[PDB]
Each structure stands twice: as C-alpha cells, then as structure tokens.
Write a protein that holds these residues in place. Structure first.
Motif, short mmCIF file in Angstrom:
data_model
loop_
_atom_site.label_atom_id
_atom_site.label_comp_id
_atom_site.label_asym_id
_atom_site.label_seq_id
_atom_site.Cartn_x
_atom_site.Cartn_y
_atom_site.Cartn_z
N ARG A 44 2.97 54.06 60.55
CA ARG A 44 2.31 54.73 62.01
C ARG A 44 3.60 53.58 62.78
N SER A 45 3.37 54.23 63.91
CA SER A 45 4.11 53.96 65.08
C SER A 45 3.21 53.47 67.01
N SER A 46 2.74 52.62 66.61
CA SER A 46 2.30 52.55 68.52
C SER A 46 2.61 51.78 69.07
N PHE A 47 3.01 52.59 70.03
CA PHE A 47 3.53 51.55 70.86
C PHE A 47 4.59 50.41 70.81
N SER A 48 5.92 50.02 71.35
CA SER A 48 7.14 49.46 70.38
C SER A 48 6.22 47.65 70.87
N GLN A 49 4.91 47.51 69.96
CA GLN A 49 4.17 46.26 70.29
C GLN A 49 5.16 45.01 70.32
N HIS A 50 4.66 43.89 71.09
CA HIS A 50 5.49 42.48 71.41
C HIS A 50 4.44 41.90 71.04
N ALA A 51 3.69 40.96 70.80
CA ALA A 51 2.65 39.68 70.60
C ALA A 51 3.18 38.76 70.30
N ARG A 52 2.69 37.35 70.70
CA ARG A 52 3.24 36.18 70.24
C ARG A 52 1.92 35.32 70.78
N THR A 53 1.82 34.65 69.30
CA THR A 53 0.84 33.91 69.46
C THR A 53 1.42 32.65 69.44
N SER A 54 1.08 31.22 70.19
CA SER A 54 0.86 30.19 69.96
C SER A 54 -0.52 29.16 70.95
N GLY A 55 -0.88 29.02 69.75
CA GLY A 55 -2.16 27.77 69.98
C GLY A 55 -2.54 27.82 68.33
N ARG A 56 -4.45 28.30 68.84
CA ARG A 56 -4.94 28.44 67.83
C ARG A 56 -5.56 29.50 67.86
N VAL A 57 -5.84 30.58 68.21
CA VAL A 57 -6.60 31.41 68.57
C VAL A 57 -5.27 32.91 68.81
N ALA A 58 -5.09 34.11 67.89
CA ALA A 58 -4.33 35.02 68.23
C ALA A 58 -5.28 36.07 68.38
N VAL A 59 -4.14 37.03 69.21
CA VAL A 59 -5.30 38.27 69.52
C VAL A 59 -4.69 39.27 68.36
N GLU A 60 -5.90 39.09 67.63
CA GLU A 60 -6.14 39.77 66.51
C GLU A 60 -5.54 41.52 67.00
N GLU A 61 -6.01 42.12 68.14
CA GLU A 61 -5.67 43.58 68.53
C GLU A 61 -6.44 43.51 69.27
N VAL A 62 -5.39 44.29 70.50
CA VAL A 62 -5.70 44.70 71.72
C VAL A 62 -5.53 46.75 71.27
N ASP A 63 -6.51 47.13 71.84
CA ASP A 63 -6.60 48.10 72.03
C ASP A 63 -5.88 48.84 73.05
N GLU A 64 -4.28 49.85 72.70
CA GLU A 64 -3.47 49.45 73.71
C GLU A 64 -4.45 51.05 74.80
N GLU A 65 -5.57 51.38 74.66
CA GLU A 65 -6.11 52.47 75.37
C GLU A 65 -6.79 51.41 76.41
N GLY A 66 -6.76 50.84 75.94
CA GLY A 66 -7.44 49.25 76.76
C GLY A 66 -9.34 49.53 76.00
N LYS A 67 -9.86 49.66 75.43
CA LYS A 67 -11.38 50.12 75.07
C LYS A 67 -12.22 48.82 74.34
N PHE A 68 -11.21 47.80 73.50
CA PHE A 68 -11.53 46.62 73.52
C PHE A 68 -10.62 45.66 73.31
N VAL A 69 -11.03 44.83 73.85
CA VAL A 69 -10.05 43.45 73.12
C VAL A 69 -10.07 42.54 71.74
N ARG A 70 -10.09 42.87 70.20
CA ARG A 70 -9.94 41.73 69.43
C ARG A 70 -9.50 40.76 69.32
N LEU A 71 -10.01 39.02 69.48
CA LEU A 71 -9.76 38.01 69.39
C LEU A 71 -9.91 37.41 67.86
N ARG A 72 -8.69 36.54 67.43
CA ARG A 72 -8.84 36.53 65.79
C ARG A 72 -8.52 34.66 66.49
#
Length: 151
Positions: free
Chosen positions: A27-55
């Motif tokens: 599958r392909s959901s937008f040209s994702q482009h994440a970049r973690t830098s620390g301890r916490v990382a953006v697990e998954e953020v609903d593109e629609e903006g329904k919710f923001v999952r941080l791991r």
C-alpha cells in the motif's frame, strides 16, 4: 536353528521456506517522510488527523511534563498540542492522542482525546512534529499525498 538381529537407519531431506522471505510493496499512503531524533518517536500519525500515536524507543521512562506536538497542515493555523506536566511515556510504551472530532474514546494515559481542538487537521500535505519541553523538535513526521502537479 535360530536367527535375527538387524541394523539399519538412515534418512534426510525436506522442503522448508520458499527461498528467502520478504515480500515488499502493498500500500501507499502519501509520500511519508518522518525523522525521529531522540527517545520518543512518532509511532504513527493518521494523515486524516484523527489521532496521533506516539511511541517510545528509549529504555528509560521518558517524562513528557511539558512536551508538545506541532501540527502543521496546508495553509492553516499551526496547532501545538502541549502535553500535560504530569505525563510520563514509559520506555517502549505508546500513547494515542485522538482528536475531539475523530470518533475516539478518551482512554488515558494510553489513548487521549484532544478536546481543546476539533481535529488534528486533514489535507494532502500534513506536518506533525514533536517538541520536547524546550522549543526543540525531537521527532518529526511529515506526510504528503500524491496529488496532481500545478499546470
């Protein structure tokens, strides 16, 4: 008259696996482009903006008593969801920050419901970054939908 005794035993061979195992593309959901830098990382953020999952990736409980989340999508008002000063994202833990208008269910500390706002924000182009206590980003999560080009 008598007879008996015998000795014999041998064997070997089988077919396991189908030569490696990877299987890419699905599958392909937008040209994702994440970049973690620390301890916490953006697990998954609903593109629609329904919710923001941080791991959390760190092994040491991470304190988010001031942390915040920068939400910038299209030409709209950038919203900075400042976490509570009484929050701690354990190591290897995860949290979900649902949006008021996202048919979610306040289930903290895990799940959360952004009442202040009505929705993280939708649109082809979305930008979600994480700002620790200080005005500094630790992890970023951008998402751009494969839309048409300007002609």
């Amino acid at each position: 008259g008598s007879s008996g005794s015998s000795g014999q035993s041998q064997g070997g061979g089988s077919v396991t696996k189908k030569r490696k195992l990877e299987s890419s593309e699905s599958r392909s959901s937008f040209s994702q482009h994440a970049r973690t830098s620390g301890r916490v990382a953006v697990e998954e953020v609903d593109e629609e903006g329904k919710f923001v999952r941080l791991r959390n990736k760190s092994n040491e409980d991470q304190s988010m008593g001031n942390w915040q989340i920068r939400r910038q999508n299209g030409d709209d008002p950038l919203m900075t969801y400042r976490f509570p000063p009484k929050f701690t994202l354990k190591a290897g833990q995860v949290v979900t920050i649902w949006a008021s208008g996202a048919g979610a269910t306040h289930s903290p500390p895990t799940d959360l419901v952004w009442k202040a706002q009505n929705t993280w924000g939708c649109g082809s182009s979305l930008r979600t970054a994480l700002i620790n206590s200080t005005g500094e980003e630790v992890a970023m999560r951008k998402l751009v939908r494969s839309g048409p080009s300007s002609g």
